[PDB]
Scaffold this active site. Structure first.
Site, PDB file in Angstrom:
ATOM      1  CG  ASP A 124      15.361  48.351  82.192  1.00 47.49           C
ATOM      2  OD1 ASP A 124      14.349  49.076  82.295  1.00 47.49           O
ATOM      3  OD2 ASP A 124      15.764  47.612  83.115  1.00 47.49           O
ATOM      4  CE  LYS A 129      34.231  49.370 100.334  1.00 45.83           C
ATOM      5  NZ  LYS A 129      33.813  47.946 100.304  1.00 45.83           N
ATOM      6  NE  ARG A 171      14.576  48.373  87.125  1.00 44.66           N
ATOM      7  CZ  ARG A 171      13.872  48.178  86.019  1.00 44.66           C
ATOM      8  NH1 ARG A 171      12.823  48.930  85.724  1.00 44.66           N
ATOM      9  NH2 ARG A 171      14.227  47.202  85.187  1.00 44.66           N
ATOM     10  CG  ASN A 172      18.260  50.122  85.227  1.00 40.88           C
ATOM     11  OD1 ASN A 172      18.761  49.352  86.047  1.00 40.88           O
ATOM     12  ND2 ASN A 172      17.478  49.706  84.238  1.00 40.88           N
ATOM     13  N   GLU A 200      20.783  41.583  94.924  1.00 37.21           N
ATOM     14  CA  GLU A 200      20.845  40.262  94.316  1.00 37.21           C
ATOM     15  C   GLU A 200      19.607  40.028  93.464  1.00 37.21           C
ATOM     16  CG  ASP A 242      20.387  47.834  82.085  1.00 37.27           C
ATOM     17  OD1 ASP A 242      19.800  47.273  83.035  1.00 37.27           O
ATOM     18  OD2 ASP A 242      19.971  47.784  80.908  1.00 37.27           O
TER      19      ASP A 242
HETATM   20  C1  LIG Z   1      23.481  52.821 100.055  1.00 39.69           C
HETATM   21  N1  LIG Z   1      23.764  51.902  98.962  1.00 39.69           N
HETATM   22  C2  LIG Z   1      24.452  52.207  97.890  1.00 39.69           C
HETATM   23  C3  LIG Z   1      24.497  51.047  97.083  1.00 39.69           C
HETATM   24  C4  LIG Z   1      25.185  50.895  95.727  1.00 39.69           C
HETATM   25  O1  LIG Z   1      26.252  51.542  95.353  1.00 39.69           O
HETATM   26  C5  LIG Z   1      26.615  51.195  94.102  1.00 39.69           C
HETATM   27  N2  LIG Z   1      27.649  51.609  93.326  1.00 39.69           N
HETATM   28  C6  LIG Z   1      27.819  51.130  92.105  1.00 39.69           C
HETATM   29  N3  LIG Z   1      26.987  50.217  91.593  1.00 39.69           N
HETATM   30  C7  LIG Z   1      25.949  49.767  92.299  1.00 39.69           C
HETATM   31  O2  LIG Z   1      25.059  48.808  91.780  1.00 39.69           O
HETATM   32  C8  LIG Z   1      25.246  48.630  90.397  1.00 39.69           C
HETATM   33  C9  LIG Z   1      25.827  47.465  89.918  1.00 39.69           C
HETATM   34  C10 LIG Z   1      26.008  47.290  88.552  1.00 39.69           C
HETATM   35  C11 LIG Z   1      25.599  48.274  87.663  1.00 39.69           C
HETATM   36  N4  LIG Z   1      25.779  48.161  86.216  1.00 39.69           N
HETATM   37  C12 LIG Z   1      26.484  47.093  85.508  1.00 39.69           C
HETATM   38  O3  LIG Z   1      26.983  46.172  86.061  1.00 39.69           O
HETATM   39  C13 LIG Z   1      26.575  47.205  83.982  1.00 39.69           C
HETATM   40  C14 LIG Z   1      27.143  46.207  83.198  1.00 39.69           C
HETATM   41  C15 LIG Z   1      27.203  46.377  81.828  1.00 39.69           C
HETATM   42  C16 LIG Z   1      26.701  47.541  81.281  1.00 39.69           C
HETATM   43  N5  LIG Z   1      26.168  48.489  82.036  1.00 39.69           N
HETATM   44  C17 LIG Z   1      25.651  49.699  81.417  1.00 39.69           C
HETATM   45  C18 LIG Z   1      24.490  49.647  80.664  1.00 39.69           C
HETATM   46  C19 LIG Z   1      23.992  50.801  80.078  1.00 39.69           C
HETATM   47  C20 LIG Z   1      24.655  52.004  80.248  1.00 39.69           C
HETATM   48  F1  LIG Z   1      24.165  53.137  79.672  1.00 39.69           F
HETATM   49  C21 LIG Z   1      25.816  52.058  81.003  1.00 39.69           C
HETATM   50  C22 LIG Z   1      26.314  50.904  81.587  1.00 39.69           C
HETATM   51  C23 LIG Z   1      26.094  48.357  83.359  1.00 39.69           C
HETATM   52  O4  LIG Z   1      25.614  49.215  84.022  1.00 39.69           O
HETATM   53  C24 LIG Z   1      25.024  49.440  88.149  1.00 39.69           C
HETATM   54  C25 LIG Z   1      24.839  49.616  89.512  1.00 39.69           C
HETATM   55  C26 LIG Z   1      25.732  50.255  93.608  1.00 39.69           C
HETATM   56  C27 LIG Z   1      24.765  50.044  94.689  1.00 39.69           C
HETATM   57  C28 LIG Z   1      23.566  49.101  94.659  1.00 39.69           C
HETATM   58  C29 LIG Z   1      23.755  47.729  94.708  1.00 39.69           C
HETATM   59  C30 LIG Z   1      22.662  46.879  94.677  1.00 39.69           C
HETATM   60  C31 LIG Z   1      21.381  47.400  94.597  1.00 39.69           C
HETATM   61  C32 LIG Z   1      21.194  48.773  94.547  1.00 39.69           C
HETATM   62  N6  LIG Z   1      19.857  49.322  94.464  1.00 39.69           N
HETATM   63  C33 LIG Z   1      22.287  49.623  94.577  1.00 39.69           C
HETATM   64  C34 LIG Z   1      23.776  50.065  97.799  1.00 39.69           C
HETATM   65  N7  LIG Z   1      23.364  50.635  98.907  1.00 39.69           N
END
Ligand SMILES: Cn1cc(-c2oc3ncnc(Oc4ccc(NC(=O)c5cccn(-c6ccc(F)cc6)c5=O)cc4)c3c2-c2cccc(N)c2)cn1
Ligand SMILES: Cn1cc(-c2oc3ncnc(Oc4ccc(NC(=O)c5cccn(-c6ccc(F)cc6)c5=O)cc4)c3c2-c2cccc(N)c2)cn1
Lengths: 262, 259
Positions: free
Chosen positions: B138, B37, B142-143, B19, B156
């Site tokens: 960015d 999922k 982390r991303n 969050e 991102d």
């Molecule tokens: C054990 N564990 C696992 C997990 C976990 O699993 C996951 N699966 C999926 N998404 C996960 O979070 C995310 C959520 C959204 C994104 N992005 C976008 O929304 C996005 C939107 C618009 C555009 N772009 C974009 C921009 C540039 C680009 F080049 C390409 C795309 C984007 O990216 C990436 C990740 C997790 C996580 C999580 C959750 C919270 C914190 C942490 N730290 C990890 C958690 N705990």
């Protein structure tokens, strides 16, 4: 009260900033000694009661003598143009800086040389020797952490004080503080040293700390941390404070562990 | 625009994973009847709403296709708060994964050869994105996201130490600024999750760079590997390599190493 710890402002020359933030400002400085010679020092400056609490901290630091507890060189009183006092604490300057930054630096090629195990264990022994001293004095530190430890010019560590993850579980829920709470923080400090600068509990946020700890979870064994240094540090994280070892028991546990390795 | 949106009926929201000022697990019902999922990121400013220009992002990105770029399964509209649907990845973000590698009860010690793969992976994705003339703006460990097969893809979640010097003084962003962020991310990976520039605060960062200072070589970084990432931090953007050049230098270095 402050007699024999106060230094006349005339004898202090302030230099550049060593570090800033919300524990005041620490700067390098020259201190004119009654020897007639000048000495390199660190001068930490920083409110109605925060002033007297600042002077209160030098109280029960004024008279602390141990090679592993940071010496006090004096206190100063600077008068503002408005006439307000501006307290300053004076410490010996230490080119090696705090231990946390030094641990991180060792992992870089141009910083200090790679720290071997025997040296990382001496680091904890130093902190154990000093916190054992302060425990006998019945002084509660309450902020024990690698960032608060300073490295002496002979590469010996000494305890100082310029944070949820260093606070024992018993102190988190009820805002209490025992000598055993200090011992919990010591377990985290040995984790920082053995990890060479890692922030405690990767993956866990600050607000989850009490619950993470209330479910029996503890800091993970650092990779290549030897299987008996982890027990000594895990022993600092027992749930009952009374079941944790004393600072004097830990120090021996580290000392005889140090002289088992080649 | 539409044709990338999904009906909120086919989505079920679960617990929070992270969050800001939010990412939730969930299930997505797909065309083939199965349930997948997913991560659901819930974003904006509504006094005036450039979601019209954000659906573009979600549109322009949801038809890109590359193994090293995160898939966007679509958008969900709830009346109004938009939500972004990504596939759930159990191994999580790479930064938290690197630190875990340094602790037992965690993913085993990553050898250097695997660490280079994480780098090759990211350069490939950014080679794809920069060839499509896309500016991340960015890039950090982390991303980055770890797939079920050990593999890194660019994303991102939506950072002074990662920003380039030209982008600090002025505010210009180009593919060369992203190349600067790549070398820092490379340094993150080689240090298994160290914060960049130990000893330097964030306010000093611009002055620190203008004096010619760069990140220090990690304790065990190959000279050739430090040379590649150091190229990303040249003071003139036009002297830094491109992601396509960078990709081939890391692939050649990685294959030169023992198996
Ligand atoms: C054990 N564990 C696992 C997990 C976990 O699993 C996951 N699966 C999926 N998404 C996960 O979070 C995310 C959520 C959204 C994104 N992005 C976008 O929304 C996005 C939107 C618009 C555009 N772009 C974009 C921009 C540039 C680009 F080049 C390409 C795309 C984007 O990216 C990436 C990740 C997790 C996580 C999580 C959750 C919270 C914190 C942490 N730290 C990890 C958690 N705990
Ligand atoms: C290259 N470089 C070098 C340096 C540098 O050198 C140094 N030398 C000396 N002090 C240094 O800071 C300090 C300053 C004050 C303290 N403490 C107290 O004032 C203190 C007061 C009242 C009571 N107690 C106390 C409490 C409990 C005890 F059990 C014992 C004592 C105390 O401690 C400890 C350290 C530095 C630094 C510095 C400066 C800023 C940031 C960083 N990160 C490093 C910087 N850069």
């Amino acid at each position: 009260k402050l007699e024999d710890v106060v230094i006349d402002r005339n004898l202090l020359i302030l230099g550049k900033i060593l570090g800033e933030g919300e524990f005041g400002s620490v700067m390098e400085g020259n201190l004119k000694q009654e020897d007639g010679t000048s000495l390199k020092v660190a001068v930490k400056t920083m409110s109605q009661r925060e002033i007297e609490e600042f002077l209160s901290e030098a109280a029960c630091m004024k008279d602390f003598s141990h090679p592993n507890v940071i010496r006090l060189l004096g206190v100063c009183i600077e008068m503002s143009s408005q006439g307000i006092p501006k307290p300053m604490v004076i410490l010996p300057f230490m080119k090696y800086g705090d231990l946390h930054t030094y641990l991180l630096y060792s992992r870089l090629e141009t910083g200090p040389k790679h720290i071997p195990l025997q040296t990382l264990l001496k680091f904890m022994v130093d902190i154990a020797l000093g916190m054992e001293y302060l425990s006998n004095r019945n002084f509660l530190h309450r902020d024990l952490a690698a960032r608060n430890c300073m490295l002496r010019d002979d590469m010996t560590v000494c305890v100082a004080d310029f944070p949820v993850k260093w606070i024992a579980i018993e102190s988190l829920a009820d805002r209490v503080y025992t000598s055993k709470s200090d011992v919990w923080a010591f377990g985290v400090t040995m984790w920082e040293i053995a990890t060479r600068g890692m922030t405690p509990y990767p993956g866990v946020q600050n607000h989850e700390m009490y619950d993470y700890l209330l479910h029996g979870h503890r800091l993970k064994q650092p990779e290549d941390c030897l299987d008996e240094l982890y027990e000594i540090m895990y022993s600092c994280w027992r749930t009952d404070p009374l079941d944790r070892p004393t600072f004097s028991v830990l120090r021996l546990q580290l000392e005889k562990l140090l002289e088992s390795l080649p």
